[PDB]
């Protein structure tokens, strides 16, 4: 000091202002703009705590959620909590059963169906040795599920729950498939 220049010359003293993170690179500000027409706003999202006391001790067991993986699919959790229909509980089993071999998933996601569909021809285990059956299949296996079929309609949230499911082995099919698979 008595001869150097030190940087910070203040002791320990500076007040900085509100800096903002980054200039507009991919972020909105708040809610889309162009919401509607009545560009009278007013109303504004309250304190919604009226739902979340329900994950207290969904059981007297013992589990609680905290440091672990973070996988999208923690989010569709509640997609699954949406309806556990004695019908759809069957799905989750068929899941958990093998999520990494489309090859089966699309030859046996008949034992899961709705009861009404009677189009499905299902796929002899013998009739996927090659990509060119699971390619061909997985085309009719989404019409099997094709929302126009599944709109507003009883099984409609099965569709979901498998149409993502076909497609969701199917990219690692790519990486999983194109490899001797027998």
Same mark, same amino acid.
């Given at each position: 000091?008595?001869?150097?220049?030190?940087?910070?010359?203040?002791?320990?003293?500076?007040?900085?202002?509100?800096?903002?993170?980054?200039?507009?690179?991919?972020?909105?500000?708040?809610?889309?703009?162009? %919401?509607?027409? +009545?560009?009278?706003?007013? &109303?504004?999202?309250? =304190?919604?705590? /009226?739902? *979340?006391? !329900?994950?207290?001790?969904?059981?007297?067991?013992?589990?609680?959620?905290?440091?672990?993986? %973070?996988?999208? +699919?923690?989010?569709?959790? &509640?997609?699954?909590? =949406?309806?556990? /229909?004695? *019908?759809? !509980?069957?799905?989750?089993?068929?899941?958990?059963?093998?999520?990494?071999?489309?090859?089966?998933?699309?030859?046996?996601?008949?034992?899961?169906?709705?009861?009404?569909?009677?189009?499905?021809?299902?796929?002899?285990?013998?009739?996927?040795?090659?990509?060119?059956?699971?390619?061909?299949?997985?085309?009719?296996?989404?019409?099997?599920?094709?929302?126009?079929?599944?709109?507003?309609?009883?099984?409609?949230?099965?569709?979901?729950?498998?149409?993502?499911?076909?497609?969701?082995?199917?990219?690692?099919?790519?990486?999983?498939?194109?490899?001797?698979?027998?």
């Amino acid at each position: 000091g008595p001869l150097g220049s030190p940087e910070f010359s203040m002791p320990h003293s500076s007040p900085q202002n509100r800096p903002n993170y980054n200039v507009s690179f991919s972020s909105m500000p708040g809610g889309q703009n162009e %919401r509607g027409k +009545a560009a009278a706003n007013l &109303e504004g999202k309250q =304190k919604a705590a /009226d739902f *979340e006391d !329900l994950l207290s001790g969904q059981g007297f067991n013992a589990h609680k959620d905290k440091k672990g993986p %973070r996988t999208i +699919a923690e989010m569709r959790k &509640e997609e699954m909590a =949406k309806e556990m /229909d004695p *019908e759809k !509980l069957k799905i989750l089993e068929w899941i958990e059963g093998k999520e990494r071999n489309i090859r089966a998933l699309l030859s046996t996601m008949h034992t899961v169906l709705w009861a009404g569909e009677t189009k499905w021809k299902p796929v002899g285990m013998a009739d996927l040795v090659t990509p060119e059956q699971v390619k061909k299949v997985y085309r009719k296996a989404v019409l099997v599920v094709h929302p126009d079929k599944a709109t507003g309609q009883p099984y409609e949230q099965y569709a979901k729950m498998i149409f993502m499911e076909l497609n969701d082995a199917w990219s690692e099919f790519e990486n999983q498939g194109q490899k001797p698979l027998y």
